[PDB]
């Protein structure tokens, strides 16, 4: 299974309009070796995908958002399910690969009364503690807190890539317009200008938060190359007995 295999089937897997969904597992199968992927908890909290695969023969741990179930929104169960998997892959020197298509955290009253803050913090801590190589690909929308919950470059991420369909933003673009130009009340052209200037990875790209805007068909090849150079990564952290995860 050649390491530089192209994956043209991923060229048009992300639908143009933002109200359509797709199966992230198809992307995972296209990218990984021989389209083999051992899933973990495939029936519980189906809006996050975690499992083991192989890249160029090396074991890798795949984490990703599923834009089918609950639009990919993060909640308590998905937070715990992804957090423990990431922590395990950390404990045993297994590299991590993330596919980010999260619109944000799931809103509601049951989520708040259940302690969504604690479990979201669990996932954030699991990604921020990771000293193994981490490669992140942003297929589509990444707004709100979730953008940096899902292993942003700012969490000491190694290499962050973006597909040409990525949308990195502070929060909902319409919400951003309504919260910035409230005193303007002329959002007719303001919304168009704001989506033109901020519904693209270009703000993050010019800020350097993403390393490149890769074509979808190079993904596997790129990742393989990275997994070589980062195989020697070593990082030093302050001494402690152990940390206090929000368990």
């Amino acid at each position: 299974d050649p390491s530089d295999r192209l994956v043209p089937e991923l060229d048009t897997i992300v639908p143009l309009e933002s109200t359509k969904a797709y199966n992230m597992v198809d992307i995972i199968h296209s990218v990984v070796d021989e389209r083999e992927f051992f899933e973990i908890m495939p029936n519980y909290a189906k809006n996050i995908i975690v499992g083991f695969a192989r890249m160029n023969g090396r074991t890798v741990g795949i984490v990703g958002n599923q834009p089918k179930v609950a639009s990919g929104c993060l909640d308590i169960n998905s937070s715990v399910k992804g957090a423990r998997f990431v922590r395990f892959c950390d404990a045993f020197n297994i590299p991590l690969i993330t596919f980010v298509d999260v619109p944000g955290f799931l809103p509601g009253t049951a989520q708040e009364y259940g302690g969504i803050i604690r479990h979201g913090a669990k996932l954030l801590y699991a990604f921020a503690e990771a000293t193994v190589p981490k490669v992140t690909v942003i297929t589509r929308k990444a707004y709100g807190g979730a953008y940096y919950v899902m292993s942003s470059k700012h969490l000491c991420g190694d290499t962050n890539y973006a597909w040409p369909t990525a949308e990195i933003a502070v929060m909902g673009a319409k919400g951003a317009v309504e919260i910035i130009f409230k005193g303007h009340e002329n959002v007719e052209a303001a919304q168009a200008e704001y989506i033109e200037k901020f519904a693209n990875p270009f703000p993050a790209a010019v800020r350097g938060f993403v390393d490149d805007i890769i074509q979808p068909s190079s993904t596997r090849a790129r990742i393989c190359c990275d997994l070589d150079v980062l195989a020697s990564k070593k990082v030093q952290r302050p001494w402690r007995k152990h940390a206090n995860i929000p368990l």
Partner: protein, 261 residues
């Protein structure tokens, strides 16, 4: 004659007053203190040493470069001090300046305080009172949030971290208190929720007020996020000093030992 002197003095006097006296009066109207007097009550008298008083936001979008939108300090007061003679690093968020919303300079100052504390080995206390994330700032606000969270995770188990929510907090800013060791709140004025009630209306259409969604009672009786809730600002600060007397300054130091009877 150089204008540097009176420029510095005017900037100092504008910084110590936050973002206007009328807004401070409004802040006292809702039964809340300003950031500087909170720090004065928390720390031993004549021991607060402030850093980065003149640091200003570098944002230049949506007309934010105009002088009317420039406030030295930029919605955060940061420094060090002593509680009962023991060193501590403290940051407090000011709701007067842009609603306390977090921008590049705000997060940079908080990060510098956290880095210095982890260098020396002293606890960090944060008084969180902020509307949310500055949308005018742009992605820089998200970058600052993520930097603060990274330093929180790095310092977990190294130095104690205490968060006191002294006002509304929403958005990603709720994750700093969740990644710290302890999280106290003030009754009837503090709020912790990811999304406001209007979003709940827009999504699931359930009638909940701010107090029911993210009040101190909710997070101390049925959520598990918060640890204790105090009557008001003064009681919360006094209890916070009392609680700080228990903790060791760092993981390397042994448990404190006092005079016993």
């Amino acid at each position: 004659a150089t204008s540097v002197n009176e420029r510095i003095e005017n900037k100092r006097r504008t910084a110590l007053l936050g973002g206007g006296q009328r807004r401070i009066d409004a802040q006292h109207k809702r039964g809340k203190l300003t950031a500087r007097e909170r720090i004065s009550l928390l720390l031993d008298p004549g021991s607060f040493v402030e850093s980065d008083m003149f640091v200003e936001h570098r944002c230049a979008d949506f007309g934010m470069a105009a002088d009317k939108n420039k406030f030295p300090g930029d919605s955060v007061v940061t420094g060090r001090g002593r509680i009962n003679g023991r060193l501590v690093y403290v940051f407090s968020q000011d709701f007067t300046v842009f609603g306390g919303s977090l921008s590049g300079a705000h997060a940079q100052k908080i990060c510098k305080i956290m880095d210095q504390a982890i260098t020396v080995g002293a606890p960090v206390i944060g008084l969180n009172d902020s509307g949310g994330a500055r949308i005018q700032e742009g992605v820089e606000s998200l970058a600052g949030y993520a930097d603060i969270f990274l330093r929180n995770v790095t310092a977990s188990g190294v130095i104690p971290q205490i968060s006191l929510i002294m006002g509304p907090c929403a958005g990603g800013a709720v994750y700093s208190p969740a990644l710290t060791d302890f999280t106290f709140m003030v009754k009837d004025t503090s709020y912790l929720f990811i999304t406001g009630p209007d979003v709940v209306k827009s999504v699931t259409n359930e009638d909940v007020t701010q107090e029911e969604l993210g009040g101190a009672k909710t997070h101390t009786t049925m959520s598990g996020v918060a640890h204790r809730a105090f009557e008001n600002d003064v009681d919360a600060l006094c209890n916070l000093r009392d609680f700080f007397n228990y903790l060791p300054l760092s993981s390397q130091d042994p448990a404190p030992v006092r005079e016993c009877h």
